[PDB]
Design an enzyme around this catalytic site. Structure first.
Site, PDB file in Angstrom:
ATOM      1  N   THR A 112       0.819  -1.205   0.000  1.00 24.43           N
ATOM      2  CA  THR A 112       0.000   0.000   0.000  1.00 24.43           C
ATOM      3  C   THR A 112       0.856   1.261   0.000  1.00 24.43           C
ATOM      4  O   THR A 112       0.417   2.294  -0.507  1.00 24.43           O
ATOM      5  CB  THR A 112      -0.979   0.006   1.175  1.00 24.43           C
ATOM      6  N   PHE A 165      -7.307   4.462   6.370  1.00 22.83           N
ATOM      7  CA  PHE A 165      -6.541   3.487   7.138  1.00 22.83           C
ATOM      8  C   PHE A 165      -7.396   2.580   7.990  1.00 22.83           C
ATOM      9  O   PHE A 165      -6.898   1.994   8.949  1.00 22.83           O
ATOM     10  CB  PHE A 165      -5.519   4.184   8.007  1.00 22.83           C
ATOM     11  N   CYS A 169      -5.275   0.846  10.683  1.00 18.27           N
ATOM     12  CA  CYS A 169      -3.942   0.498  10.220  1.00 18.27           C
ATOM     13  C   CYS A 169      -2.920   0.757  11.321  1.00 18.27           C
ATOM     14  O   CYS A 169      -2.856   1.855  11.885  1.00 18.27           O
ATOM     15  CB  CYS A 169      -3.603   1.286   8.958  1.00 18.27           C
TER      16      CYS A 169
HETATM   17  C1  FDE Z   1       3.211  -1.963   8.097  1.00 21.18           C
HETATM   18  C2  FDE Z   1       1.969  -1.369   7.533  1.00 21.18           C
HETATM   19  C3  FDE Z   1       2.062  -0.290   6.634  1.00 21.18           C
HETATM   20  C4  FDE Z   1       0.723  -0.027   6.366  1.00 21.18           C
HETATM   21  C5  FDE Z   1       0.287   1.036   5.433  1.00 21.18           C
HETATM   22  C6  FDE Z   1      -1.090   1.276   4.960  1.00 21.18           C
HETATM   23  C7  FDE Z   1      -1.479   2.201   3.914  1.00 21.18           C
HETATM   24  C8  FDE Z   1      -0.644   3.114   3.070  1.00 21.18           C
HETATM   25  C9  FDE Z   1      -2.870   2.121   3.776  1.00 21.18           C
HETATM   26  C10 FDE Z   1      -3.165   1.151   4.747  1.00 21.18           C
HETATM   27  C11 FDE Z   1      -4.319   0.623   5.174  1.00 21.18           C
HETATM   28  C12 FDE Z   1      -5.013  -0.161   5.992  1.00 21.18           C
HETATM   29  N1  FDE Z   1      -4.236  -0.870   6.832  1.00 21.18           N
HETATM   30 FE1  FDE Z   1      -2.192  -0.799   6.961  1.00 21.18          FE
HETATM   31  N2  FDE Z   1      -0.136  -0.808   7.005  1.00 21.18           N
HETATM   32  C13 FDE Z   1       0.657  -1.637   7.710  1.00 21.18           C
HETATM   33  C14 FDE Z   1       0.037  -2.537   8.427  1.00 21.18           C
HETATM   34  C15 FDE Z   1      -1.103  -3.032   8.872  1.00 21.18           C
HETATM   35  C16 FDE Z   1      -1.374  -4.064   9.769  1.00 21.18           C
HETATM   36  C17 FDE Z   1      -0.471  -5.000  10.531  1.00 21.18           C
HETATM   37  C18 FDE Z   1      -2.843  -4.020   9.803  1.00 21.18           C
HETATM   38  C19 FDE Z   1      -3.735  -4.934  10.599  1.00 21.18           C
HETATM   39  C20 FDE Z   1      -4.290  -4.043  11.695  1.00 21.18           C
HETATM   40  C21 FDE Z   1      -5.325  -4.824  12.439  1.00 21.18           C
HETATM   41  O1  FDE Z   1      -5.517  -4.562  13.633  1.00 21.18           O
HETATM   42  O2  FDE Z   1      -5.940  -5.708  11.822  1.00 21.18           O
HETATM   43  C22 FDE Z   1      -3.213  -2.997   8.918  1.00 21.18           C
HETATM   44  C23 FDE Z   1      -4.586  -2.568   8.606  1.00 21.18           C
HETATM   45  C24 FDE Z   1      -5.058  -1.637   7.564  1.00 21.18           C
HETATM   46  C25 FDE Z   1      -6.476  -1.460   7.223  1.00 21.18           C
HETATM   47  C26 FDE Z   1      -7.656  -2.142   7.854  1.00 21.18           C
HETATM   48  C27 FDE Z   1      -8.016  -3.448   7.222  1.00 21.18           C
HETATM   49  C28 FDE Z   1      -9.436  -3.794   7.665  1.00 21.18           C
HETATM   50  O3  FDE Z   1      -9.964  -4.707   6.959  1.00 21.18           O
HETATM   51  O4  FDE Z   1     -10.018  -3.195   8.670  1.00 21.18           O
HETATM   52  C29 FDE Z   1      -6.467  -0.438   6.132  1.00 21.18           C
HETATM   53  C30 FDE Z   1      -7.639   0.127   5.395  1.00 21.18           C
HETATM   54  N3  FDE Z   1      -2.174  -2.380   8.353  1.00 21.18           N
HETATM   55  N4  FDE Z   1      -2.158   0.655   5.443  1.00 21.18           N
END
Ligand code: FDE
Ligand code: FDE
Ligand code: FDE
Ligand code: FDE
Lengths: 455, 451, 453, 454
Positions: free
Chosen positions: C266, C391, C398
């Protein structure tokens, strides 16, 4: 003197169940025993059981007049594919007495001499595989032992050849069984028994019981026609009960086939794997056992009498099964109201679990070197106290294949010591995988052939 | 309506074997992590429930449903603190009486009177460090106990402990530390009449006689020949009853203020000074503010109030290691806590302050990071999330006193010295009933700035 | 009260034929444009409802009623990511266990430690472009995978992938894209157990073994001496505060896969898109290079300097708004509930947040949703709650969110400091879809500003 | 273990039906369940259903995503005069959801406070009847309980007075209603329903429908000439469907009156007769319950708050309905192909029967004293497993009058204990009459007045 019982951490309504959410519940229960002592109560929603660790209470719990074999919550789950077989049936069920009295002839010292030839058959296939490995290759210990133990119960018990050594991935029967037993164990630690994650598993669990049954149906059909044998299977189809005059229910025979294929190879494979792990870690006991095997096994193939004369191999095997009993626990319940240890009351029906690995590390019985692998403790088979060494259960529900196991492991452990030198080339750190039984996981070795012939 | 988690029990001893350590507060924290926001803790004869989340603490801080309870710990210190302000039930005759007599002494107006005396002690501390030779170092919590004990002595009672004229601790301090250790050790004690503890009983009384011996010394020195906290103890009359304090309570109030008024402040400055030498950017930012605001030979009352970032350092220190780590409550009337837990009248709750201040739902995932800048705007902070000084009408009477002292001293330390953690000190938190870092030592390079 | 819309149906196959293209997310974005804020999408065994409006997404992001679900796509990726952080259920033991031990590896204090390693990888990229001959060009997504993969390798595991010393991609990335594309193509299969897919099953397994042969290379090179304080140290040695245990050998294996994949794939898509919008929007490109020239006054940038590239971050925010390189995340209904007061839901019913569609809600962003206007992100406080969700959401958001942005700024900062970029082909944007999104065949030319390193 | 299902003896083309050629089938199926275990298949000409007896499988069958309520052949016969009313409608029928959402308001614990006054009326008539008996007379329990329970649902539900206590034979409505219910059960056994043997019974069945409709016409008309009230009948005529805005069909409205007159009196009287049976047979629980009643019922008339405070009274009633669930069974079918218990596969649409008395007799849950009446089973109500105690059905089709029934039974049983001591002068041996519900037959007691005023 009537005292209350220790109990590990509780999590509200789930009681102690979150403690069983691990991949190794028995080693987790062992760790709880060290912190809580000889006895503690373990509560889960709907169930209550008490875990025993000392010979003082275990000798008392083994009185068959006050306590009877209980189906632990684990055995009820194994019963979904083994049913009312010898292992997962209640003592008072009609098929326990009936099946016990019909199949006991198959494990008499008279029966063992007939099996010996067939046990040597599979034993030679394993040696022959190891003699044909190239110098760089290695051996996966529990995998080749499962090849040997499964093929052995098939040929001696049912005259069926799995031909596992002609497979390089595990046999399709063992994979479904392993998953079914792992499922059985995971059902113990399972909170929501309808949570979105657990709906697929009953699809796989159903698929895995059918694969196991498609094999026993294959064993029954392979007999129906293809004959003359007086096997464990011959007593199953034809044996009438001396007390009732009846043969086994058709449904019971299929449940019995499953029982002996599972219980009759799974724990023996762990035993051999643990036994060989301990030898490769203690080179003086290994050399001493390798010279006894060199002494007694003077023919290309071992005879029945020669196996009985491997006293040190037997002591090695017993000290292996002392530290890591491959069937690690068995259960009892309280026939009647009684007081255990003069301190703990039990109402009728209360459940007890014997921790065989904890019992076998009791300092009161074994001394200071309980964690040391000293096969020399079993030179005094008579000096061992009563109810101190119980890897084969207790009483009338004890392991029926105890002499069968001992003979098979000794023969096989003997030929390996006679025919190979073993190197722990990886400095293996013991990792004990737990289905419901125990075996060392990813244990590997290299074996230098002593180039001694077979036949 | 949920059941409550509980740690491992040992039969008739219940959970007591678990707190059989020299550090009970840090052990209950490790249990809070394993069991969560609330758990039950049983010992033979007592049962109490430990809380860890702002969610539940905000309900426990409800003055209509819960009242200050004397935990088993405070019941034992009561053997020498008696019915003084700290160890009293709210409904006791002497609580509101002493509360109403002594509160005048902690107004932002007596505080200005104290400032001159705080600077006196504060300059003695600077001069001790400025006179150290090059290889010498500073035992931090020991010199802080020197300063706070002298300060509550001079401001409170016009009495000079002269702790900087002593290389060993002051004999009063030795007996107070042993008594507080006894109070804490009695909580975990299985059979309390066993011969093992027979020496402890005769020492515990020897240490109370020593503390009372100094209280006789303080009272007589005033009968000899001011408008301080001791003037009010002897002269104040309770507006509700028109009567002054009993001579038996007076001794208990002096003991209380000598203990509670230096023990937690000494731990606080030691923790603040620990985090500073461990976070050198926060240390330069704080030492720059002290250089900026403190332009005179001694700081004035207004200048201390302008040490805003220094005040944030102090606040961030006491959040992580609140030197009075717990306070207790009971139920007063039958109630349900948080909508899941029923409580009967009289049931006991304990607030685990170090745990409440580690609520990721309140402070974020950097709860263990030392970021004084979380206190750039204290009014943005939820209520009942930051409780280093207790709650309600039984909260700490002297927090404006402490914060003023801690700022004043910390400000001058940052102005006059450079601090080296020459030992790579690893944090070791000693527990009497209060919390302190133990072997915390540093070296101090003087900036050669006059006083 | 309202029945739910559903696109054209094809007999027993339900709606499955409709996504039989190489660009299924862009096909769903189109379906959303005709059918609106929510529509039901049926497949032979499964049913899912796609949400596109902030109105409904704010309710789906309510954790008391909805929790993270494994879409059919993630259930297939769980075939090689296993029990890792991304593909675990929040109610599984290994999620909270791995979260609590690995969350420290992303605390601000760690970013300063990673910063030195991050610069190493970026300097290699700058000098690679400095050594191109005059007629040669640059493949944007191809060099960006080189950078992000090497970065997660060095920061995470102290392992040198050495991608800039490579022909075509590394064998891991070459094997991983096939595994991710197989996962995406399994979604179109009317009957999977059909024999025609045996070559696919064989190839999918062969690619799983390759990826593990590399995690095993990383584990073996570490326990062969070991005082690092990286993410892999925490996987091996840290114990979970709630349970006191460390991670499974099996699970440490699953997390290494997890972090190598989602932690570069990503990020590489993100950077390729930002560079697309820069060469297509020459006013923002000059403002971004004028700030980068201003702030990066040293031969190498410091952690403090990158945190001050405010406009560069705003470009990155507006890039990932338009093309969130992880285009969707899935939720399910904890218990029976009504969504939007209009559509009732049973416990466990599945919802899909269509992130590129959420970011095009004209009721939130205004009537210029297709414009690359970085200045919507000047005072982020105006942004309504749950309108910008690149995210994920909540406790399953994330984990490397700060890790990524810091890496992305550092590299984007240095490219702008050292180069002017020519879109010499008038590249027409073509969005390749693995399970993630990246521009396919994007190329530029870069004249060096000849500033030393 | 993916097993085959046990089945009792078959009789050719009549299948297992001859085994149900009794006047008391539930106790006969109970006898089979005890002999065959947790599940057996039961075949009749054209029909097949599988009977469940263990909490283990009943826990699976009560899963609302996998199984939905089925109208057994018994309920399909009751559909002949109850139609699409709440009890005999499919969940997916348009009127169910419609009528369910409009009438659910009528069972709110706030609506319960309105009923308390009216329930007290009928309850006072019961005590005063028993206080006006001469010394030699005795009490026929199930007839007076039905006298009361019917009067309660009529006054509370429809503001209509059957005045059942101003008659000494059963109400004309009740006799035809009982004959209709007995007829429905008896159709479940007919080797051929067009044999001339059943021709009178087929005319009687129509005769019995016309009388029940002749009364249903009286309850709607007596409200036509009034307002007012805010009772259950108001919601049927005026209540709008929340989703579609339609009121109930006037042809559905009638089926709903019939439904509540039947289901809202028949099982409550069986309950009270059973509860009174166990008290008079377990004399110490009778004294423990009367003491609680004397303590809580301190005024001449009981209040709503006091009924909720008769904690032991509720325990006795619960152990009564556990031993003999007055609605003894409910039926289910298989939404989609699934495997039951991991051993028994089911095709889509196959039917299950939950046998409540056997479910309430599981040794795995209640212990080894499952046949003993120990009200102390219901002290920690949370200590009972889930899907172990199901006297009111399951899920969204559970009994809508559950909090209504318990308030009556507790209230009336409370006043009996306060005002009388009960002598079982006959040592009554329990005989269980089976229509479609359960009631004790010929149960009689004599009652000495405790001479407490009203
Ligand atoms: C080392 C690293 C770097 C990064 C970056 C990034 C960018 C530029 C955009 C993004 C996103 C994201 N993530 Fe990211 N990332 C990472 C990681 C991760 C892990 C181990 C996880 C699992 C957490 C939990 O608690 O399941 C994620 C996680 C993530 C998410 C959520 C999936 C679901 O199915 O809820 C999203 C929408 N991420 N991302
Ligand atoms: C064939 C075979 C083989 C074997 C082996 C073995 C080894 C190595 C170990 C063992 C063990 C055992 N077992 Fe064993 N085995 C067998 C078997 C068996 C059976 C059948 C049983 C059941 C019996 C009765 O109960 O009857 C057993 C059994 C047994 C036991 C017990 C169980 C209980 O719970 O009690 C134990 C502990 N085993 N084991
Ligand atoms: C002088 C002084 C000083 C001080 C300081 C301080 C610091 C640093 C900290 C602190 C704290 C505190 N406190 Fe403090 N302080 C003081 C004091 C006090 C008193 C007197 C008290 C009691 C109050 C009443 O109750 O009234 C306190 C109080 C206090 C508290 C509460 C406790 C309970 O039990 O609740 C707390 C938590 N304190 N603190
Ligand atoms: C008024 C009333 C009263 C009552 C009561 C009673 C008693 C005591 C018992 C009972 C029961 C019952 N329910 Fe009952 N109930 C009632 C009612 C009812 C109704 C309407 C119904 C139907 C519902 C629905 O589904 O929608 C019932 C319902 C009911 C049930 C179910 C059926 C089935 O199929 O599932 C049962 C089991 N219920 N229940």
């Amino acid at each position: 003197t009537i005292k209350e019982m220790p109990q590990p951490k509780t999590f509200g309504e789930l009681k102690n169940l979150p403690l069983l959410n691990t991949d190794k519940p028995v080693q987790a229960l062992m760790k709880i025993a060290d912190e809580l002592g000889e006895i503690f109560k373990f509560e889960a929603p709907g169930r209550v059981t008490r875990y025993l660790s000392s010979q003082r209470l275990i000798k008392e719990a083994c009185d068959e007049s006050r306590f009877d074999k209980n189906l632990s919550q684990a055995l009820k789950f194994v019963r979904d594919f083994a049913g009312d077989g010898l292992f997962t049936s209640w003592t008072h069920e009609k098929n326990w007495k009936k099946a016990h009295n019909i199949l006991l002839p198959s494990f008499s010292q008279q029966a063992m001499k007939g099996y010996h030839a067939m046990m040597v058959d599979i034993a030679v296939q394993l040696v022959q595989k190891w003699e044909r490995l190239n110098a760089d290759e290695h051996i996966e210990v529990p995998e080749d032992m499962t090849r040997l133990t499964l093929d052995t119960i098939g040929l001696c018990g049912f005259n069926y050849r799995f031909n596992s050594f002609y497979r390089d991935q595990p046999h399709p029967f063992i994979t479904s069984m392993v998953r079914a037993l792992d499922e059985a164990m995971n059902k113990l630690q399972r909170a929501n028994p309808d949570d979105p994650a657990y709906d697929e598993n009953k699809r796989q669990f159903q698929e895995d019981i059918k694969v196991m049954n498609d094999l026993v149906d294959k064993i029954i059909a392979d007999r129906k026609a293809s004959e003359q044998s007086d096997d464990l299977l011959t007593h199953m189809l034809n044996g009438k009960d001396p007390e009732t005059g009846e043969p086994l229910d058709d449904e019971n025979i299929r449940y019995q086939i499953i029982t002996f294929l599972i219980a009759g190879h799974e724990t023996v494979s762990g035993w051999l794997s643990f036994a060989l792990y301990f030898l490769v870690k203690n080179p003086h006991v290994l050399q001493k056992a390798a010279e006894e095997a060199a002494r007694v096994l003077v023919d290309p193939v071992p005879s029945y009498k020669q196996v009985k004369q491997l006293k040190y191999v037997g002591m090695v095997l017993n000290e292996a099964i002392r530290l890591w009993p491959t069937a690690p626990a068995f259960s009892l319940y309280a026939k009647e109201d009684t007081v255990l240890g003069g301190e703990y009351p039990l109402e009728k029906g209360d459940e007890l679990m014997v921790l065989i690995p904890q019992l076998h590390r009791d300092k009161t019985i074994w001394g200071d070197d309980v964690e040391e692998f000293r096969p020399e403790r079993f030179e005094n088979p008579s000096a061992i106290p009563q109810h101190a060494f119980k890897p084969f259960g207790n009483g009338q529900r004890a392991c029926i294949g105890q002499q069968f196991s001992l003979h098979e492991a000794t023969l096989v452990l003997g030929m390996m010591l006679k025919h190979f030198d073993f190197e722990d080339h990886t400095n293996y750190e013991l990792d004990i995988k737990e289905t419901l039984t125990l075996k060392p996981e990813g244990f590997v070795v290299k074996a230098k052939s002593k180039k001694i012939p077979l036949g």
